[PDB]
Amino acid sequence: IMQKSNKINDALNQHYKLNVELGLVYAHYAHVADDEFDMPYLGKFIQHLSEDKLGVHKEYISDYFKRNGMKLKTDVSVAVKSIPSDAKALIQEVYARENEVRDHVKAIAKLALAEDDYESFYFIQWYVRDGLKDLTEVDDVVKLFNSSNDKLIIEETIKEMVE
Amino acid sequence: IMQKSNKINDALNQHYKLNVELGLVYAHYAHVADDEFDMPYLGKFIQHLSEDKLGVHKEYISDYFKRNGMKLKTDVSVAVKSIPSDAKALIQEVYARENEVRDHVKAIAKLALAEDDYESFYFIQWYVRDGLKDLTEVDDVVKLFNSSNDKLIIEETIKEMVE
Amino acid sequence: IMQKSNKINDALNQHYKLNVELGLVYAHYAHVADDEFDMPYLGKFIQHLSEDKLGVHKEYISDYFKRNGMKLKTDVSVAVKSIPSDAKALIQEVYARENEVRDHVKAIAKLALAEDDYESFYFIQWYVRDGLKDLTEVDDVVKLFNSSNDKLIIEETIKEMVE
Amino acid sequence: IMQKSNKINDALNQHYKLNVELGLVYAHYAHVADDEFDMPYLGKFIQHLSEDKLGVHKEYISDYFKRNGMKLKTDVSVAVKSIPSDAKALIQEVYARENEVRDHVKAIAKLALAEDDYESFYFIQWYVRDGLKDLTEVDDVVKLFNSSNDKLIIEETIKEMVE
Amino acid sequence: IMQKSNKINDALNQHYKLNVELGLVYAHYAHVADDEFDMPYLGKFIQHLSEDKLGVHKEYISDYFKRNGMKLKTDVSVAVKSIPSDAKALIQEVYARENEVRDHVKAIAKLALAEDDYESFYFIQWYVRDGLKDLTEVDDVVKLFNSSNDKLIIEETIKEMVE
Amino acid sequence: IMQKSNKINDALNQHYKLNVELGLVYAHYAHVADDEFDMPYLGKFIQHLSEDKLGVHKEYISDYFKRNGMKLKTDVSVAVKSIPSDAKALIQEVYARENEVRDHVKAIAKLALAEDDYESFYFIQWYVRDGLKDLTEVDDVVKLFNSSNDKLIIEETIKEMVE
Numbered sequence: 006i007m008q009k010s011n012k013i014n015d016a017l018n019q020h021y022k023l024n025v026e027l028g029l030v031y032a033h034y035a036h037v038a039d040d041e042f043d044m045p046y047l048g049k050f051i052q053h054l055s056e057d058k059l060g061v062h063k064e065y066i067s068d069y070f071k072r073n074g075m076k077l078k079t080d081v082s083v084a085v086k087s088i089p090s091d092a093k094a095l096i097q098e099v100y101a102r103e104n105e106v107r108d109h110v111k112a113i114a115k116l117a118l119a120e121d122d123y124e125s126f127y128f129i130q131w132y133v134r135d136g137l138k139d140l141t142e143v144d145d146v147v148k149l150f151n152s153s154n155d156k157l158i159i160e161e162t163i164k165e166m167v168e
Numbered sequence: 169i170m171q172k173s174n175k176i177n178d179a180l181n182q183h184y185k186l187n188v189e190l191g192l193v194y195a196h197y198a199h200v201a202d203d204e205f206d207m208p209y210l211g212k213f214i215q216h217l218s219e220d221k222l223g224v225h226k227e228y229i230s231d232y233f234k235r236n237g238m239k240l241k242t243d244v245s246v247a248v249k250s251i252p253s254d255a256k257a258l259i260q261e262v263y264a265r266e267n268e269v270r271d272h273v274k275a276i277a278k279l280a281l282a283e284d285d286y287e288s289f290y291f292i293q294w295y296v297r298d299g300l301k302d303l304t305e306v307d308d309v310v311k312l313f314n315s316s317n318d319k320l321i322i323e324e325t326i327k328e329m330v331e
Numbered sequence: 332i333m334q335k336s337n338k339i340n341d342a343l344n345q346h347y348k349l350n351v352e353l354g355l356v357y358a359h360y361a362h363v364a365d366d367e368f369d370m371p372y373l374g375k376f377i378q379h380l381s382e383d384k385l386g387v388h389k390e391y392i393s394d395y396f397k398r399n400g401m402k403l404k405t406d407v408s409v410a411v412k413s414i415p416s417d418a419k420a421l422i423q424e425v426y427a428r429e430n431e432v433r434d435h436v437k438a439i440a441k442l443a444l445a446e447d448d449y450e451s452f453y454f455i456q457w458y459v460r461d462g463l464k465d466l467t468e469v470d471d472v473v474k475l476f477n478s479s480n481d482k483l484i485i486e487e488t489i490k491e492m493v494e
Numbered sequence: 495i496m497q498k499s500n501k502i503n504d505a506l507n508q509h510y511k512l513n514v515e516l517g518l519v520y521a522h523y524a525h526v527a528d529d530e531f532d533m534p535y536l537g538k539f540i541q542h543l544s545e546d547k548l549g550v551h552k553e554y555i556s557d558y559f560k561r562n563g564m565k566l567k568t569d570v571s572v573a574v575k576s577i578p579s580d581a582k583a584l585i586q587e588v589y590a591r592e593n594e595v596r597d598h599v600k601a602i603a604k605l606a607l608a609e610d611d612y613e614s615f616y617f618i619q620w621y622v623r624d625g626l627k628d629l630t631e632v633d634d635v636v637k638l639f640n641s642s643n644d645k646l647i648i649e650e651t652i653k654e655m656v657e
Numbered sequence: 658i659m660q661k662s663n664k665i666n667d668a669l670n671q672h673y674k675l676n677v678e679l680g681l682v683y684a685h686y687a688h689v690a691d692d693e694f695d696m697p698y699l700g701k702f703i704q705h706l707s708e709d710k711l712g713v714h715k716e717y718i719s720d721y722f723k724r725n726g727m728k729l730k731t732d733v734s735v736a737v738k739s740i741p742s743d744a745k746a747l748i749q750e751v752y753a754r755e756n757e758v759r760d761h762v763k764a765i766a767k768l769a770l771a772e773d774d775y776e777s778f779y780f781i782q783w784y785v786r787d788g789l790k791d792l793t794e795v796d797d798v799v800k801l802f803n804s805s806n807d808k809l810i811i812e813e814t815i816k817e818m819v820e
Numbered sequence: 821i822m823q824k825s826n827k828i829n830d831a832l833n834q835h836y837k838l839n840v841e842l843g844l845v846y847a848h849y850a851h852v853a854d855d856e857f858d859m860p861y862l863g864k865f866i867q868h869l870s871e872d873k874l875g876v877h878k879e880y881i882s883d884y885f886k887r888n889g890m891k892l893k894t895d896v897s898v899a900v901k902s903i904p905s906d907a908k909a910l911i912q913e914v915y916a917r918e919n920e921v922r923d924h925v926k927a928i929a930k931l932a933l934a935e936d937d938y939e940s941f942y943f944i945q946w947y948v949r950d951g952l953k954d955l956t957e958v959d960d961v962v963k964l965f966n967s968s969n970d971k972l973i974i975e976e977t978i979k980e981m982v983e
């Protein structure tokens with residue numbers, strides 16, 4: 006009498022895929038921030054976000070599926086074929102992707118209510134809140150590039166954020 | 169006077185890609201071991217191996233590239249399109265893939281000597297040793313399925329291995 | 332039945348001499364960084380590298396010779412007859428010399444294999460790894476001069492590196 | 495795709511046999527050093543070397559075989575049919591045998607590279623280093639017999655070495 | 658007025674030889690128990706018994722000889738030319754050899770009284786008691802193979818015995 | 821109104837050079853004491869003196885120059901082209917060089933007073949005292965070779981001095 010929603014199943018499989026692929030992209034951007042742009046703390050901030058997407062962001066869905074009978078799907082393809090031209094544009098790109106996360110998460114909450122899937126509406130509340138948190142942390146680094154022209158000042162300020 | 173080997177660069181980019189894709193496959197197999205085969209400790213063993221491949225196995229290469237000027241490439245595609253039929257065949261599949269890792273790692277060591285790239289030969293020694301270690305840990309779980317017909321006995325024995 | 336290689340003996344005596352003379356040059360550059368360029372932390376970084384070259388870098392060879400019957404040779408001549416014009420070029424010079432160290436160390440590893448001197452190949456692995464480490468630490472200071480125009484910002488950033 | 499080298503298998507079985515038989519000989523020499531030559535600390539030094547050869551020196555090979563599918567062979571024959579005439583010649587004999595160990599270990603490293611068996615080249619690095627260490631510790635006792643004519647002085651000096 | 662018995666000297670040299678050769682055989686059986694029969698705890702039990710035979714069982718005799726003027730003889734030959742077909746028969750074989758130890762030890766006690774060698778009768782009391790102890794510990798593992806058909810149950814039970 | 825004395829500048833640059841070159845010679849003699857003469861504690865005593873000359877003895881001058889505007893000069897050449905024939909003559913040679921240090925240091929103090937350079941007279945007081953201290957410590961080892969014919973007795977006595 007509690008059959009899982011296929012629509013929610015698909016939307017969460019899509020979101021699983023987004024977090025894997027985002028995490029793989031951020032792992033690359035973390036590398037570039039350190040190696041090419043000489044900003045290892047910016048690299049550490051982005052690497053932390055990468056391990057976040059490839060960790061709890063995907064594991065919570067996988068665990069959730071175990072409990073309710075939804076089917077997990079692993080279908081992944083991502084190629085980092087060009088890189089932003091400097092550190093500001095790099096973190097600006099990360100921002101734009103985190104903003105899209107908020108839009109994807111919102112669609113899932115809306116769908117969960119349309120499906121009368123209150124377990125799924127409960128489960129997604131965490132993503133609803135974290136969408137704004139991850140976006141805010143990234144926004145706190147974007148602001149640094151408009152507040153100083155000095156890479157090492159910026160780096161020094163980031164070091165108190167991923168501490 | 170210390171220009172990086174393109175051949176080693178490619179072979180390590182390929183190995184980076186193998187560890188990402190293997191890690192994504194193992195994350196799926198971990199899920200199935202718990203959810204479908206009712207073996208959450210086998211699932212915990214495979215999840216640990218997944219986080220190993222998607223963690224230090226790929227990060228050491230990325231860090232190494234930063235030091236020597238090799239170029240990191242992120243080009244990933246993996247789809248888990250069928251799953252082994254039971255827990256024994258699942259861990260047997262994991263075994264077969266770890267055995268292939270040893271063959272890939274051996275080719276890189278051999279290439280590093282052919283290139284007179286002793287930094288790369290040093291760097292790969294860790295993978296040379298870990299290839300046998302990961303294979304042995306997986307082999308220690310395969311043996312359980314030939315030693316008992318009782319899933320819960322096996323599960324109980326695995327619990328002292330990923331402890 | 333285990334007679335020491337004269338070729339390895341000479342190559343390690345040459346490397347002993349390189350580390351003494353490099354260490355004496357860096358001791359001078361450390362002085363100049365502090366006294367002339369007003370960068371005492373850059374001076375502390377270079378002094379640490381000096382004591383590294385004049386310490387374990389030369390002592391490991393001397394100890395090794397004691398064990399295998401190779402002959403130690405002390406033949407040293409170095410004069411610091413001009414100094415780079417500013418702090419950036421100073422650390423750039425240190426970089427260029429550490430990069431040459433990697434090339435010298437690589438020749439010794441290659442020779443050890445050609446001689447079937449596996450004790451010497453083992454012994455040099457430490458230098459193979461440290462060549463990249465010392466180069467990376469120096470590279471981490473070079474990057475600072477391209478990341479800021481402010482000596483005191485740079486100095487402040489170096490202070491968290493030789494801490 | 496990772497089939498074990500029979501040549502390495504044989505060379506390591508031979509080395510297993512050497513460490514057993516050497517250990518049995520040293521256990522006898524330890525006895526004689528104490529009982530016949532009145533040098534119990536020299537006896538303790540040689541007994542420690544005996545337990546070294548009959549312990550980790552043979553166990554590491556046996557463990558290694560478990561991991562890679564090589565076959566262990568136990569084929570042992572040793573008879574101590576004459577004993578050196580005094581303590582100096584006793585420790586001189588031990589020295590000569592440890593020097594031969596270095597030659598045997600070197601042949602195995604060389605063979606491992608010829609076989610492209612990098613797991614075996616990794617595994618033998620420990621023996622490559624320990625060959626010089628055991629030889630050096632034994633050499634440190636040989637030197638005592640050329641530095642003093644007084645057994646009890648020598649004994650007293652050995653007591654700070656196997657401490 | 659206290660001249661050592663040659664008969665006891667020979668019987669203890671023979672027993673020294675038995676403990677060396679038994680210890681070498683058990684080291685091999687320990688390997689097989691783990692590697693071939695997938696029972697590493699059974700392997701750990703047999704390895705412990707091996708180090709027992711090759712340790713105090715032989716050292717007590719060697720020490721005893723030092724005190725009373727008996728001559729130590731090292732004459733060793735052992736080849737493990739076939740292995741029992743499964744774990745039960747392996748531990749059954751170990752049992753049969755430990756039972757023979759009790760018979761050999763009993764002959765020495767009897768001889769010591771016939772020789773009026775009360776020091777030797779005292780010295781052998783330890784072996785008289787340990788013969789039954791080692792036999793009992795081995796018997797406690799034999800019983801497991803008649804109490805369960807499940808290798809992993811047996812393994813789990815052995816793990817609380819060599820703990 | 822406080823212009824640095826060129827004469828003191830030269831005399832301290834010469835003394836800087838003496839301590840570097842002496843330190844390099846002692847590092848070699850330390851090696852020989854251990855390796856050739858079988859006296860590792862004598863080697864440890866001489867190595868400590870080497871690190872003394874190449875450390876504070878040269879660094880105090882370099883630091884002093886930073887404070888008063890004197891120019892540091894690095895002009896070093898030393899070759900150890902023959903070695904004394906035995907341990908006594910080795911330490912006798914070290915003694916003779918430390919005695920010359922006292923004469924060089926005395927000339928600098930005398931010059932500092934002739935120049936009315938009381939900062940330089942203050943600065944050299946440390947060297948005035950250390951000249952006698954280093955000479956006394958070396959003299960305490962020379963005395964050992966006239967007090968015993970037994971290398972190991974001497975070695976044992978040195979071990980309580982560089983402790």
Ligand SMILES: [Fe+3]
Nearest residue numbers: 011012014015
């Ligand atoms: Fe569907």
Ligand SMILES: [Fe+3]
Nearest residue numbers: 053054057142
């Ligand atoms: Fe976080």
Ligand SMILES: [Fe+3]
Nearest residue numbers: 070071075203
């Ligand atoms: Fe599921």
Ligand SMILES: [Fe+3]
Nearest residue numbers: 084085086087
């Ligand atoms: Fe792209």
Ligand SMILES: [Fe+3]
Nearest residue numbers: 042091092093
């Ligand atoms: Fe940038």
Ligand SMILES: [Fe+3]
Nearest residue numbers: 057062135139
């Ligand atoms: Fe998050």
Ligand SMILES: [Fe+3]
Nearest residue numbers: 158161484487
């Ligand atoms: Fe600041």
Ligand SMILES: [Fe+3]
Nearest residue numbers: 161162165487
């Ligand atoms: Fe700060």
Ligand SMILES: [Fe+3]
Nearest residue numbers: 161162164165
């Ligand atoms: Fe701060």
Ligand SMILES: [Fe+3]
Nearest residue numbers: 174175177178
């Ligand atoms: Fe290419």
Ligand SMILES: [Fe+3]
Nearest residue numbers: 216217220305
């Ligand atoms: Fe692990």
Ligand SMILES: [Fe+3]
Nearest residue numbers: 040233234238
């Ligand atoms: Fe890079």
Ligand SMILES: [Fe+3]
Nearest residue numbers: 247248249250
């Ligand atoms: Fe598939």
Ligand SMILES: [Fe+3]
Nearest residue numbers: 205254255256
């Ligand atoms: Fe199953």
Ligand SMILES: [Fe+3]
Nearest residue numbers: 220225298302
């Ligand atoms: Fe691993």
Ligand SMILES: [Fe+3]
Nearest residue numbers: 324325328813
């Ligand atoms: Fe249990």
